[PDB]
Nucleic acid binder design. Structure first.
Length: 118
RNA sequence: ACACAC
């Protein structure tokens, strides 16, 4: 088991305020709204995106590392449906999106100019 | 199941 230490534990050498969201049971259409509904109480979300390239996944970005730490520690193993759409969460390696519009699979919670690009 | 989701 990993001992808690700075510069070694996941929470002290891999934190970039960005997280990856893996869906275990995509029996329903996942959207940026439901991901925001569970991520917003964990902190002020800034961006959300969804992709299907290798399965079913989503991404989230926070205004602070502290919001990403409690989101990754509370929403992990949680479910969107309260019976299905189970989650897994970990720190992401990229650090910024290049969002171009807002819709059910892509969104930006601070740039209003992408709302008309739908 | 790691953003570039058209």
């Amino acid at each position: 088991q990993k001992i808690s230490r700075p510069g070694d534990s996941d929470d002290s050498r891999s934190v970039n305020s960005v997280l990856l969201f893996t869906i275990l049971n995509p029996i329903y259409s996942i959207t940026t709204d439901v991901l925001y509904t569970i991520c917003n109480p964990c902190g002020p979300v800034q961006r959300i995106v969804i992709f299907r390239k290798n399965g079913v996944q989503a991404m989230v970005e926070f205004d602070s590392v502290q919001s990403a730490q409690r989101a990754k520690a509370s929403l992990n193993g949680a479910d969107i449906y309260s019976g299905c759409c189970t989650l897994k969460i970990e720190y992401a390696k990229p650090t910024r999106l290049n969002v171009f519009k807002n819709d059910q699979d892509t969104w930006d919670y601070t740039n209003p100019n992408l709302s008309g690009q739908g």
